[PDB]
């Protein structure tokens, strides 16, 4: 599959949880970005699709205070903006 | 699919990351147990299949200092021991 190139904030984010390359499959981008959200426990305790981005590297990348995981297009759109595909 | 009943240590472990039931599909047991490992960052930074269990609730449940994720049977065997299927 094609390799995508994370922009700096998202590269910093992926590396912060042990990714070690400049280019990645989308599938790996999604693995490490999930790992990161859980590693920092930014998910809501009771409604676990809600992610809190305020005052985190993620909110700097995404440009929102919070989002819902269920909004698939919205999440891909935010991710692609942080990638050179 | 069948619902399994976590034994107390593993129930404590699943609840510690927001699972809210006494019975669960295996698939959900595996989702929350993965979430937990990442939430506590017990995975090795450089070789990410290695999980450190020393001095954690997980090592009390599993009965090991460390394990490799790649040892599929071994991981299921440890999990079933912590479940009434």
């Amino acid at each position: 599959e094609t390799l995508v190139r994370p922009k700096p904030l998202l590269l910093k984010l992926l590396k912060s949880v042990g990714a070690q390359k400049d280019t990645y499959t989308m599938k790996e981008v999604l693995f490490y970005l999930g790992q990161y959200i859980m590693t920092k426990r930014l998910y809501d305790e009771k409604q676990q699709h809600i992610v809190y981005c305020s005052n985190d590297l993620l909110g700097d990348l995404f440009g929102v205070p919070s989002f819902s995981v269920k909004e698939h297009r919205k999440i891909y759109t935010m991710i692609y903006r942080n990638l050179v595909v | 699919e069948t619902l399994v009943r976590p034994k107390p240590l593993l129930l404590k472990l699943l609840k510690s990351v927001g699972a809210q039931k006494d019975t669960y599909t295996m698939k959900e047991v595996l989702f929350y147990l993965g979430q937990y490992i990442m939430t506590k960052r017990l995975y090795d930074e450089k070789q990410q299949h290695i999980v450190y269990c020393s001095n954690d609730l997980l090592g009390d449940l599993f009965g090991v200092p460390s394990f490799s994720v790649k040892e599929h049977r071994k991981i299921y065997t440890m999990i079933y021991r912590n479940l009434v299927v």
Partner: peptide
């Protein structure tokens, strides 16, 4: 549903 599941559902 865990965050992990919801996440996995993106694919």
């Amino acid at each position: 549903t865990s965050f992990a599941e919801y996440w996995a559902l993106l694919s």
